[model samples]
Target: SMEQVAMELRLTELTRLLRSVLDQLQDKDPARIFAQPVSLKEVPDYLDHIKHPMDFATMRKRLEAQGYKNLHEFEEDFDLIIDNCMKYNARDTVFYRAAVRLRDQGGVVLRQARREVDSIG
Candidate 1:
């Protein structure tokens, strides 16, 4: 129970911190990515806290690790997101790329956080 509790605490803090980084990457420039704004669906409070990923798939992938997992799992998913963004080279993809980087770095921090918190009571 304590292990689960610690995991939850780490995840919550991780999401908040990661969301903050993604917020910092919002594509707010005058340059538009698509003919219209990136149409977004409603996001859950925990998942939506970050800069929403460009697509539903990416969005879902990002939040799958509500619990701790190997860092590589996330990196693999994120790598695909970045690669697809480059292949498409569509509007606002650059922004998406930046957001991906932010998430990746944030993820590493989160992983470390889990380790840091795991040793505690």
Candidate 2:
């Protein structure tokens, strides 16, 4: 299933996000901070229909029609994927950092993410 593959890409992102949360939890003494479960559901009717547009106004309307009213609205969706290129860029960044850090001891990809999960909680 192409949808699942595309979705798992986002899931992989969500998993990487948990690593950051785990680090945060241990860094704080109380251990109160814990990663919340985030269920990823693609907006099936979302931007999949979009075609690249060179015009901002047109782009806005298309996005709006897909239920993304504005950049701010989308930002409110998740702190992580507030932009279209975010997932891919984060994915690339993780791979790149991991590749570069391979030489150093205790080196792992430094993929950091914030509270995209706790937005609803």
Candidate 3:
């Protein structure tokens, strides 16, 4: 019962955090073009992990449609997003935290993909 209660509370807090993050982004970037992946949806299961909430497979496809040939393109844009966040001093927010995490992880993701491609080639 206690565990269930904790899970419920976490889910609620995560949902609220996600909404606040979205609001900050929407206000920060009115076009809603940047950080599409991070703004997609929060993974309630990963409530403890402050990660980009986009569904990876789906977001990848969406990015491909937007002329992103590969993860590198997305990574570049994510890096830009982080830079913009810093430029605008949008710190002390959930969106900023997620942007930082995504930007940091993007490098690792690109390296992993490159390693995989090299291994196969």
Candidate 4:
């Protein structure tokens, strides 16, 4: 029972860190473009250009479902959203610019989380 309680507490800490990182990204995106899944009706070519698609809403769902096994896995999905945007949109477009900004800002947030986790361990 003690071991189970310790494991649960660790998981709760990890989840809190992940949520804060995600919230920072969402706050940084002013246009809210990355806030939800890209609509095929709005951008029919998105799927054709990018094989994998990701969004903040999807990540939230995954987080609640415990779909991510670790912080690295959460980071992978975070990177995937930016990568997908950069891949599908031209460098000159606003989406591309936003993705680049998010990538840089989000990196800082992730690194901070890593350090926090390390300290706990």
Reference-based TM-score of each model: 0.40, 0.26, 0.38, 0.89
User: Against the true structure, whose lDDT is highest?
Assistant: 4
Each candidate's clash count = 2, 0, 0, 0
What TM-score should be assigned to candidate 4?
A: 0.89
Residue 12 in model 3: shift from native, Å?
Answer: 39
Minimal lDDT window, size 10, model 1: 28-37
Alpha-carbon lDDT, every model: 0.45, 0.33, 0.47, 0.86
Per-residue alpha-carbon lDDT of candidate 3 for residues 10-110, written as tens digits (9 for 90 to 100) = 55544443333334333444334343443325434443443333433343344434444333554454455566555433688765665566556555545
Highest TM-score, which number? 4
Model 2 over residues 17-116: C-alpha lDDT tens digits?
Answer: 4445434422331321111211125434334432221222332343434444222433333232212323322546742243223213112222212235
Root-mean-square deviation of every model: 9.4, 17.4, 16.8, 1.6
When sorted by TM-score, best at the front, the candidate numbers are: 4, 1, 3, 2
Over 24-100, each residue of candidate 1 has an lDDT whose tens digit, in order, gives 33232223332122344532342343342343234343655453143344445444444444544445656556545
Residue-level lDDT tens digits of model 4 in 60-86: 998776567678899899999999988
Candidate 3, residue 54: lDDT: 42
List clashing residue pairs in candidate 2: none
Off by over 4 Å in 1: 28-78, 89-121
Show model 2 residue runs off by greater than 4 Å: 30-115, 118-121
The local lDDT score (0 to 100) that residue 80 gets in candidate 1 is 45
What lDDT is obtained when candidate 4 is compared to the true structure? 0.86
